[PDB]
């Protein structure tokens, strides 16, 4: 009773199961380095404006 | 100070928006009023100096230069009025604008707190001077003169910028009050001796030293007049002021990096006054006399004693007034003969018996006349130098002798003698050019009556 598959039945995903587990961390990836922290603050005017040479404001 | 340099800016629209016939008058009168309101900053009832802002300050060294700069402008402006009278009105007004720009920038220099402000203004002063010398000089050597006068300064001043930038990167502020109270003793290395030289050999060029002075005769001889007034009266003092301000951050290197410059100043002062003894050109004679005077100021600032800084200030102001006066007196004859050769016209005091008194007083100012702020300065720096080393009076006395000689020789071979009867063009006199000499001399008498003001940081 083996029926031939029709035109596009072998060209699609098919949802298997298994007793296996998921592989935890494929690629054997190391831990990611932590990014540099963000400066938390409500920003204010520059202290004495521009510290340039002699401009006051 | 703002109340002094905003009106000075308003003097420019006063030029451009006024009539052609009522422009010299208005700007002259209002310049006299700027000079008047430049006396509020002589109200120093205290030891603490006058800070008006982060930008501007005024010490007893600033204030005389400020007042003299504001006071010269009417004199330059009236002296500049016979020549370029047949010039187009726009050309006149451009001359006026350049002189007022000089006024403003020089006030800003002497009032500055930081050294970079002082730098950019000390260098901005070059552009008006160059324009005045070149577009309004009468001869063809004015171009080489402008090149010399510009590039000596720039050569000296680029290292100055580098040293100021270093000091900012090292300390952080470059302000003069803070560099006073926070000055670390220097480690006495070549890297700091080069710093000393970079800080000093911009001002020493401008004062000038005798090794480097060739810009000053070529410019004085060829600038029309008002350029000569300024170049003799405050552009040379713009180096002494800078030395007095910047030397505080160079201790103890001034004890041994000063021998060459004291020595050059002294010997070359003698050399310059000897040149003044024998010189065909009157406008060059005044210039070499200015070198022989500013050399004493160099040595005095190098010694860094109270008497010495004091006498330096006195000599600065006195020399400025009397040198401007002598340049005016020579221009008074040059506007008639159109020759700088002195032995050409040599028998005046017949036609000009009153100008010949202004001549005499101008010379007696020049030589060491005692009741005068010239001799006070010369004497006090002589006393400082004698304390420094007793063997310097041997040179100062030679200078005193030659300085009587060339001044009296100037007077004699210009006024005394037989009139050059072939000069029908000796017009009697101008009330303008008599008032000029009066306005140069009356301050000398007043300041002699009260030299408590004309001293400096130390008294
Ligand atoms: C004019 C009429 C039109 C209406 C005007 C409005 C009047 C008004 O009420 O507001 C004026 C407005 C505000 O007055 P305010 O809020 O009551 O007082 C605030 C302080 O004045 C605060 O002012 P400040 O002192 O802090 O000045 C701010 C700014 C200054 O910003 C500026 O405005 C620059 C002014 C020019 C100097 O930077 C500075 O702090 C000073 C640095 C100056 C740098 C100069 C360096 C270059 C040297 C000069 C070179 C020569 C010019 C260029 C070349 C020319 C040849 C081609 O102030 C002004 O515009 C006055 C200008 C003062 C000139 C300073 C002279 C030095
Ligand atoms: C204690 C220590 C005190 C210090 C003592 C100083 C010792 C050193 C002595 C220096 C000797 C200098 C000398 O040889 O005198 C030459 C000098 C030569 O003049 P001159 O050749 O006979 O003049 C005739 C003209 O050539 C021909 O024209 P003129 O006939 O029309 O001239 C008439 C007269 C006309 O003179 C005037 O009209 C004076 C102008 C000011 C008017 C005052 C307005 C009053 C209202 C005030 C408010 O003379 C003038 O034009 C010269 C005007 C400049 C006078 C300068 C004043 C210097 C005083 C120094 C202090 O003698 C003087 O006339 C100067 C006055 C005397 C010197 C001051 C004597 C000391 C007085 C104590 C202060």
Swiss-Prot record, chain A:
<comment type="function">
    <text>Accessory subunit of the mitochondrial membrane respiratory chain NADH dehydrogenase (Complex I), that is believed not to be involved in catalysis. Complex I functions in the transfer of electrons from NADH to the respiratory chain. The immediate electron acceptor for the enzyme is believed to be ubiquinone.</text>
</comment>
<comment type="subunit">
    <text>Complex I is composed of 45 different subunits.</text>
</comment>
<comment type="similarity">
    <text>Belongs to the complex I NDUFA8 subunit family.</text>
</comment>
<protein>
    <recommendedName>
        <fullName>NADH dehydrogenase [ubiquinone] 1 alpha subcomplex subunit 8</fullName>
    </recommendedName>
</protein>
UniProtKB/Swiss-Prot annotation, chain B:
<protein>
    <recommendedName>
        <fullName>NADH-ubiquinone oxidoreductase chain 4</fullName>
        <ecNumber>7.1.1.2</ecNumber>
    </recommendedName>
</protein>
<feature type="transmembrane region" description="Helical">
    <location>
        <begin position="60"/>
        <end position="80"/>
    </location>
</feature>
<feature type="transmembrane region" description="Helical">
    <location>
        <begin position="113"/>
        <end position="133"/>
    </location>
</feature>
<feature type="transmembrane region" description="Helical">
    <location>
        <begin position="224"/>
        <end position="244"/>
    </location>
</feature>
<dbReference type="GO" id="GO:0005743">
    <property type="term" value="C:mitochondrial inner membrane"/>
</dbReference>
<dbReference type="GO" id="GO:0021549">
    <property type="term" value="P:cerebellum development"/>
</dbReference>
<keyword id="KW-0472">Membrane</keyword>
<dbReference type="InterPro" id="IPR003918">
    <property type="entry name" value="NADH_UbQ_OxRdtase"/>
</dbReference>
<keyword id="KW-1278">Translocase</keyword>
<feature type="transmembrane region" description="Helical">
    <location>
        <begin position="194"/>
        <end position="214"/>
    </location>
</feature>
<comment type="function">
    <text>Core subunit of the mitochondrial membrane respiratory chain NADH dehydrogenase (Complex I) which catalyzes electron transfer from NADH through the respiratory chain, using ubiquinone as an electron acceptor. Essential for the catalytic activity and assembly of complex I.</text>
</comment>
<feature type="transmembrane region" description="Helical">
    <location>
        <begin position="392"/>
        <end position="412"/>
    </location>
</feature>
<feature type="transmembrane region" description="Helical">
    <location>
        <begin position="257"/>
        <end position="277"/>
    </location>
</feature>
<keyword id="KW-1133">Transmembrane helix</keyword>
<keyword id="KW-0496">Mitochondrion</keyword>
<comment type="similarity">
    <text>Belongs to the complex I subunit 4 family.</text>
</comment>
<dbReference type="Pfam" id="PF00361">
    <property type="entry name" value="Proton_antipo_M"/>
</dbReference>
<keyword id="KW-0679">Respiratory chain</keyword>
<dbReference type="GO" id="GO:0001701">
    <property type="term" value="P:in utero embryonic development"/>
</dbReference>
<dbReference type="GO" id="GO:0006120">
    <property type="term" value="P:mitochondrial electron transport, NADH to ubiquinone"/>
</dbReference>
<feature type="transmembrane region" description="Helical">
    <location>
        <begin position="147"/>
        <end position="167"/>
    </location>
</feature>
<dbReference type="GO" id="GO:0032981">
    <property type="term" value="P:mitochondrial respiratory chain complex I assembly"/>
</dbReference>
């Amino acid at each position: 009773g083996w029926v031939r598959p029709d035109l596009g039945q072998l060209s699609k995903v098919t949802k298997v199961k298994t007793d296996r587990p998921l592989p935890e961390n494929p690629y054997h990836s190391r831990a990611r380095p932590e990014p540099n922290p963000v400066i938390e603050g409500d920003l204010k005017p520059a202290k004495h404006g521009t510290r340039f040479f002699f401009w006051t404001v | 100070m703002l109340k002094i340099i905003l009106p000075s800016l308003m003097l420019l629209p006063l030029t451009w928006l006024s009539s052609p016939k009522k422009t010299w008058t208005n700007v002259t009168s209002y310049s006299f009023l700027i000079s008047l309101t430049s006396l509020t900053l002589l109200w120093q009832t205290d030891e603490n100096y006058k800070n008006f802002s982060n930008m501007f300050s005024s010490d007893p060294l600033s204030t005389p230069l400020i007042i003299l700069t504001a006071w010269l402008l009417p004199l330059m402006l009236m002296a500049s009025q016979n020549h370029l009278k047949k010039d187009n009105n726009v050309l006149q007004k451009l001359y006026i604008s350049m002189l007022i720009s000089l006024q403003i920038l020089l006030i800003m220099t002497f009032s500055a707190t930081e050294l970079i402000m002082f730098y950019i203004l000390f260098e901005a002063t070059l552009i008006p001077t160059l324009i005045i010398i070149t577009r309004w000089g009468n001869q063809t050597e004015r171009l080489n003169a402008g090149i010399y006068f510009l590039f000596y300064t720039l050569i000296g001043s680029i290292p100055l910028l580098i040293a100021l930038i270093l000091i900012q990167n090292h300390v952080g502020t470059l302000n003069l009050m803070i560099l006073s109270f926070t000055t670390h003793t220097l480690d006495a290395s070549w890297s700091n001796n080069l710093l000393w030289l970079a800080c000093m050999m911009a001002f020493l060029i401008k004062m000038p030293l005798y090794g480097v002075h060739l810009w000053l005769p070529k410019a004085h001889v060829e600038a029309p007049i008002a350029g000569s007034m300024i170049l003799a009266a405050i552009l040379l003092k713009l180096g002494s002021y800078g030395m007095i301000r910047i030397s505080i951050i160079l201790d103890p290197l001034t004890k041994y990096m000063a021998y060459p410059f004291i020595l050059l100043s002294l010997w070359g002062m003698i050399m310059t006054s000897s040149i003044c003894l024998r010189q065909t050109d009157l406008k060059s004679l005044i210039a070499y006399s200015s070198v022989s005077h500013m050399a004493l100021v160099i040595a005095s600032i190098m010694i860094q004693t109270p008497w010495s800084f004091m006498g330096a200030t006195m000599l600065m102001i006195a020399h400025g007034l009397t040198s401007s006066l002598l340049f005016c007196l020579a221009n008074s004859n040059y506007e008639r003969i159109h020759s700088r050769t002195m032995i050409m016209a040599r028998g005046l005091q017949m036609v000009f018996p009153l100008m010949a008194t202004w001549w005499l007083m101008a010379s007696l100012a020049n030589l060491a006349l005692p009741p005068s702020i010239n001799l006070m300065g010369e004497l006090f720096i002589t006393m400082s130098l004698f304390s420094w080393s007793n063997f310097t009076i041997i040179l100062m006395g030679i200078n005193i002798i030659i300085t009587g000689m060339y001044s009296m020789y100037m007077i004699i071979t210009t006024q005394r003698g037989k009139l050059t009867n072939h000069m029908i063009n000796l017009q009697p006199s101008h009330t303008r050019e008599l008032t000029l000499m009066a306005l140069h001399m009356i301050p000398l008498i007043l300041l002699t009556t009260s030299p408590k003001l004309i001293t400096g940081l130390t008294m």
